[PDB]
Subunit: 231 residues, 3 copies
């Protein structure tokens, strides 16, 4: 059942390679940088892939893998992803917050909501009672939908009042994040952690591609542009 600890190793190893090179890249590129504003963006955007490197290595080496009893058998679960996402997503949000110079009110309401989204997901991923896992999923999705709402119908208007570079950069990112983040509830749902439509194998591969691109990718769009009165 979702025979793990061996098939998806190549995906996990690959995810570790990209995330690590992606990190060494953003490290051996932030070298100069004087502007204190651009300093935040480089800091935030380098820890995201870095944290991920750590977590992908655990899954590859086994540690981040655990078994849960549900549906009818011993089910392989990678909790290490929620260890990653728990911190990683809020940093991704901080980048956009700092880029649109959002109010401290929305930043908190955003990070805290993000906390519930991952937290609730972790719960559902480890819940033993099958039916309930989807109660947590629904709650986690509602949390993401709220975050995506303020990013789309909230951070755009405030972005379209900054500089043409800012409004244009935020938008590309906003597009990449509303799309990449919304796929997560879908993969989770059809994967080893919900219905068994798709095997852990493909559930690892899909996450590894959405991850690299929601991180190394998102970071490339951001760090290569004019990061608000700094570059």
């Amino acid at each position: 059942a979702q025979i793990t600890g061996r098939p998806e190793w190549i995906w996990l190893a690959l995810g570790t390679a990209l995330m690590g090179l992606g990190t060494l890249y953003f490290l051996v590129k932030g070298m100069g940088v004087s502007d204190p504003d651009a300093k935040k963006f480089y800091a935030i955007t380098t820890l995201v892939p870095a944290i991920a490197f750590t977590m992908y290595l655990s899954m590859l080496l086994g540690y981040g893998l655990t078994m849960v009893p549900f549906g009818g058998e011993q089910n392989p679960i990678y909790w290490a992803r929620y260890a990653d996402w728990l911190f990683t997503t809020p940093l991704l949000l901080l980048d956009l917050a700092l880029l649109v110079d959002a109010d401290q009110g929305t930043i908190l309401a955003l990070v805290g909501a993000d906390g519930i989204m991952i937290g609730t997901g972790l719960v559902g991923a480890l819940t033993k009672v099958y039916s309930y896992r989807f109660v947590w999923w629904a709650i986690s999705t509602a949390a993401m939908l709220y975050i995506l709402y303020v990013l789309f119908f909230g951070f755009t208007s405030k972005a379209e009042s900054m500089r043409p570079e800012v409004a244009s950069t935020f938008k590309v990112l906003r597009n990449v994040t509303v799309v990449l983040w919304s796929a997560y509830p879908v993969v989770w749902l059809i994967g080893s952690e919900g219905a068994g439509i798709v095997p852990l194998n493909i559930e690892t591969l899909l996450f590894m591609v959405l991850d690299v691109s929601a991180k190394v990718g998102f970071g490339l769009i951001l760090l290569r542009s004019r990061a608000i009165f700094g570059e």
Copy 2:
């Protein structure tokens, strides 16, 4: 290994009030332009929402665990500490922000609140019965330190802001010093310490203090003049 069955009604009622209290605070902060009042709404809404998630887990059994102390397995709801760990520092942040407290006292405060819950959690999961009280004492000492700065510290600075501020804070300060200090008493006499009171009534007690300490504290706050705006 029943553990979670009698107090289901309390937990479900607790999940109910925490859910509605949140939706209420969500479908109430709709407008709000002032960045200062924005903070208060953001802080005050996460508290009940966080508690919703945690009460649900207890009701669905997940937030329940068996601790082997005193020749037996014991029904311990760790989910309260998962809740409290984050929830309480937020209630204190509202207060800090209301009295425009220094970043020094905020950190000292939050830090201390972290020790309070963390220690309580440790005590609640300790196998050696005796020790559980050592941790309870250490936790109470931490609470006592917190309530001090809130009472004999945050008041003086509140009585120098505005008549709305000083009056609002005082009502909250009254509600928090009273509700917060009840917790160590319920824990001590409950299923987590001495068996004076069954897990049942305890779950009910916490559920009444939780709803008021959050949805109640929230209402008093979100109805008054919350800094630079409303």
Copy 3:
């Protein structure tokens, strides 16, 4: 080879609980007055470090913070409670140092986060069942520390040598203390019960107790007596 524990190093943990608790009451019954908001931060940060450590030292004393990890072919005792402590403690020591040199929000985050990976990774290696892998995590955690010390040494110095002669002097002493005491942790752990068998858990608990007391209570003193915290 190694084997079960929970009693020889009771004294080291007791003494460690001891010093840490006193050091905290000392820093508490010393921050009594203090009106300056700038120095306020420093007292608030420097007080919690030992307070957190007291809690984590006591747990290791009362057995709670001890656990058994299977590896190398046999079960083994590990004190995870240190990592619980360090996770929150070390970054506060960095915050004190960042606030002193008035460091940029960019580097504070780049510092805290790196510290998170440093402890976190350490914890992971400490709990890894496959023996070979534990060193892979060690290597990584050390690389994280090394970075952290770099921005402190070859980074916070130059920004310090531009503040006030008090600041520049206070920071250098601390910098000297941290770079020296922090760099021992990877050495103790590598030779200790959580790595190779060179030295028993007994002495490894002792070593960390010496290093913890000084790196916190010692550091805390050098700092709260400098007034180069703009507070009097």
